[PDB]
Amino acid sequence: EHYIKHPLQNRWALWFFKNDKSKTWQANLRLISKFDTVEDFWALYNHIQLSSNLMPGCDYSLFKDGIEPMWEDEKNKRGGRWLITLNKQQRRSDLDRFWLETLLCLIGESFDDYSDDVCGAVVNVRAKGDKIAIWTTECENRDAVTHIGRVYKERLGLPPKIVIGYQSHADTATKNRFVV
Numbered sequence: 001e002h003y004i005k006h007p008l009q010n011r012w013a014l015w016f017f018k019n020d021k022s023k024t025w026q027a028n029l030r031l032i033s034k035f036d037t038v039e040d041f042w043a044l045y046n047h048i049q050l051s052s053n054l055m056p057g058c059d060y061s062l063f064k065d066g067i068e069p070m071w072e073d074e075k076n077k078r079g080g081r082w083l084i085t086l087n088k089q090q091r092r093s094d095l096d097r098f099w100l101e102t103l104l105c106l107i108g109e110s111f112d113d114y115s116d117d118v119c120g121a122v123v124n125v126r127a128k129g130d131k132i133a134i135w136t137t138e139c140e141n142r143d144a145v146t147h148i149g150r151v152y153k154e155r156l157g158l159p160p161k162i163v164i165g166y167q168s169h170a171d172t173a174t175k176n177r178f179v180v
């Protein structure tokens with residue numbers, strides 16, 4: 001009642017990446033903490049830096065517990081990502097609101113029967129332009145990928161004029177598979 005936390009459908013892990021050239025890419029990836037209730041999500045979100053305030057070269061990742069935010073995870077190797085590319089002006093205007101909306105689409109299971117295809121999301125803070133992406137587990141599942149892309153674009157509020165693409169991790173690791 002007035003004392004039980006509200007369990008989320010999934011337990012989530014927040015990851016941090018800091019670009020450091022002394023280390024391999026994988027060694028720069030670090031798990032911050034995990035949560036599985038509404039209350040613990042907000043406690044964590046409220047304690048950490050907004051993405052717009054991180055140094056260029058850093059990432060946040062939020063993934064279902066047990067899935068690492070890397071292509072080589074069994075749940076990512078056959079998958080891909082719906083990519084949101086932000087210009088440098090949208091660092092100020094949309095980065096933080098887009099990322100929080102992305103976080104909520106994940107923990108709120110916003111993609112109906114296809115929320116099981118979601119692995120996680122990643123925001124890259126970069127000088128050349130930031131990126132936000134939702135990662136899904138199977139790039140050949142056209143129906144799941146397309147529905148997630150349509151729900152995502154509308155939850156972000158992007159105008160029907162704007163087009164976003166989905167790329168497979170196989171292609172990234174070595175073009176768009178889908179567009180909405």
Ligand SMILES: CO[C@@H]1[C@H](O)[C@@H](COP(=O)(O)O[P@@](=O)(S)OP(=O)(O)O)O[C@H]1n1c[n+](C)c2c(=O)[nH]c(N)nc21
Nearest residue numbers: 019025026057069070071072124125126127128131173
């Ligand atoms: C090794 O090279 C990979 C990739 O080319 C590099 C940069 O990925 P990045 O996502 O930073 O692309 P950007 O264009 S946003 O980066 P930048 O050019 O602006 O600094 O980081 C590595 N990388 C990245 N990811 C997501 C993986 C992974 O999942 N697995 C392995 N093994 N490597 C990975």
